[PDB]
Design an enzyme around this catalytic site. Structure first.
Site, mmCIF file in Angstrom:
data_model
loop_
_atom_site.group_PDB
_atom_site.id
_atom_site.type_symbol
_atom_site.label_atom_id
_atom_site.label_comp_id
_atom_site.label_asym_id
_atom_site.label_seq_id
_atom_site.Cartn_x
_atom_site.Cartn_y
_atom_site.Cartn_z
ATOM 1 N N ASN A 288 32.655 35.622 36.744
ATOM 2 C CA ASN A 288 33.565 36.792 36.736
ATOM 3 C C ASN A 288 33.422 37.343 35.330
ATOM 4 O O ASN A 288 34.302 37.068 34.505
ATOM 5 C CB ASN A 288 35.006 36.348 36.965
ATOM 6 C CG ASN A 288 35.231 34.889 36.631
ATOM 7 O OD1 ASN A 288 35.236 34.039 37.517
ATOM 8 N ND2 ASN A 288 35.417 34.586 35.357
ATOM 9 N N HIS A 320 47.251 30.379 36.287
ATOM 10 C CA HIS A 320 47.780 30.144 37.656
ATOM 11 C C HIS A 320 48.646 28.891 37.621
ATOM 12 O O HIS A 320 49.878 29.017 37.734
ATOM 13 C CB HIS A 320 46.635 30.016 38.668
ATOM 14 C CG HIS A 320 45.271 30.195 38.088
ATOM 15 N ND1 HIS A 320 44.523 29.134 37.618
ATOM 16 C CD2 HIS A 320 44.511 31.299 37.917
ATOM 17 C CE1 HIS A 320 43.364 29.577 37.179
ATOM 18 N NE2 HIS A 320 43.333 30.902 37.347
#
Length: 417
Positions: A288, A320
């Site tokens: 990414n 997260h």
């Protein structure tokens, strides 16, 4: 409504997300011609009205959350300004609001984790090196428009505010539809690959006691095929998401020596290089690239580089943090990747072993080990829970953890052999 989500193969929410990402193109048919439109306040108003509708369509609850964070962030644009507290409070508050979302399948935290990074990035931009002297902004609708941009909202790449305002004006270049087709056709190619692979090779198979003790060789073999086909859900949603980002004109980096314009501005992938790659330092460096470049710009550049490495990747575990699983994944880049580079310098750069192993004679085997390297690391991702993650890890004889450390103790002595 729900029968469309059952007919092809993918999940119920997965259909509402792919519809949302594909909905970017008919909406980019207005920036096709109304972009050259002299009025700029209309462009900002389009992104809010589209983004808020996209958020509401996917999940009714999120429209308030993102909006609340957006109004609170342009309130820290009024108060504090660029005084150092402003960066400290933006970093804490955004993660405090984000981590609340996890504590309270496709949840409303999907575009929220994106705007969290987009608002933190905006704060440091509102706050020099050749990159910093350009990426910095000068001096209401601006913050609301930038956050709700339809092209990059759900999972789209972070874009510099300075560069975002440019899109409203000259995008910082010729309009085109031909590269947009390239990232869309390649994006749909991987969607066919995902929808066909996902049913005959799934996640719940790794925790299932059926056959999960029978093979040993295929026990690891399943882990090679899986975590190579599961990450294709991200791949398809970054290539089709870039397709809308480039159709508007934001996807354009600039131009080269031949006058030909560059397309790797908000490119979150490089396919010929994130696949068919013997050395995964290329793959893991930045699968990414934008998500990886952001951390490399606002966390690692800002941060004593040796002590920075752990705290920069620790932020990705604060990002997260669903279970200890996501934390165990970021201690793989700071594990096998740093060990892989040591084996890269073990050859061609050693006065003992490299001498014989430097030559062309001393491909398939490396890639087979490197796709196994990915699967084992992606195991504590998807299945993040402690009981689920440990179940498949102990069943595969914990090979990755043993081999990396085994390489780590033996490696410095191989440099002497």
């Amino acid at each position: 409504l729900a029968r469309v989500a059952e007919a092809l193969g993918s999940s119920e929410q997965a259909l509402r997300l792919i519809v949302s990402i594909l909905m970017g193109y008919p909406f980019a048919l207005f920036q096709r011609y109304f972009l050259f439109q002299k009025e700029t306040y209309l462009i900002h108003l389009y992104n809010v009205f589209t983004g808020l509708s996209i958020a509401y369509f996917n999940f009714g609850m999120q429209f308030f959350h993102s909006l609340l964070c957006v109004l609170i962030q342009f309130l820290i644009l009024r108060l504090m300004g660029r005084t150092v507290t402003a960066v400290f409070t933006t970093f804490v508050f955004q993660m405090t609001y984000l981590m609340a979302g996890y504590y309270f399948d496709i949840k409303w935290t999907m575009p929220h984790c994106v705007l969290t990074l987009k608002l933190i990035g905006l704060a440091i931009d509102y706050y020099l090196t050749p990159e910093q002297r350009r990426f910095a902004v000068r001096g209401l609708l601006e913050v609301s428009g930038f956050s709700y941009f339809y092209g990059a909202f759900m999972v789209g790449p972070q874009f510099s505010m300075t560069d975002y305002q440019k899109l409203a004006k000259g995008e910082m270049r010729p309009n085109s539809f031909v590269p947009a087709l390239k990232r869309l056709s390649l994006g749909l190619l991987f969607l066919v690959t995902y929808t066909l692979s996902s049913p005959y090779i799934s996640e719940e198979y790794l925790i299932s006691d059926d056959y999960m003790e029978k093979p040993f060789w295929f026990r690891c073999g399943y882990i090679l095929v899986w975590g190579k086909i599961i990450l294709y859900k991200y791949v398809t949603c970054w290539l089709v998401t870039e397709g809308v980002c480039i159709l508007v004109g934001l996807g354009y980096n600039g131009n080269d020596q031949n006058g030909k314009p560059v397309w790797d501005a908000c490119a979150n992938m490089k396919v010929w290089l994130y696949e068919t790659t013997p050395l995964f330092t290329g793959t893991i460096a930045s699968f990414n690239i934008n998500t990886n470049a952001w951390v490399a710009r606002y966390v690692f550049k800002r941060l004593n580089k040796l002590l920075s490495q752990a705290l920069a990747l620790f932020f990705l575990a604060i990002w997260h943090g669903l279970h200890s699983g996501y934390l165990v994944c970021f201690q793989m880049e700071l594990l096998i990747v740093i060990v892989e580079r040591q084996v890269i310098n073990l050859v061609r750069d050693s006065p003992t072993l490299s001498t014989l192993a430097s030559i062309t004679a001393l491909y398939v085997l490396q890639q087979t080990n490197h796709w196994m390297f990915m699967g084992y690391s992606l195991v504590p991702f998807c299945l993040f829970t402690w009981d689920k993650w440990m179940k498949v890890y102990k069943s595969i004889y914990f090979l990755g953890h043993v081999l990396f450390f085994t390489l780590l103790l033996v490696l410095p002595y191989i440099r002497k052999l």
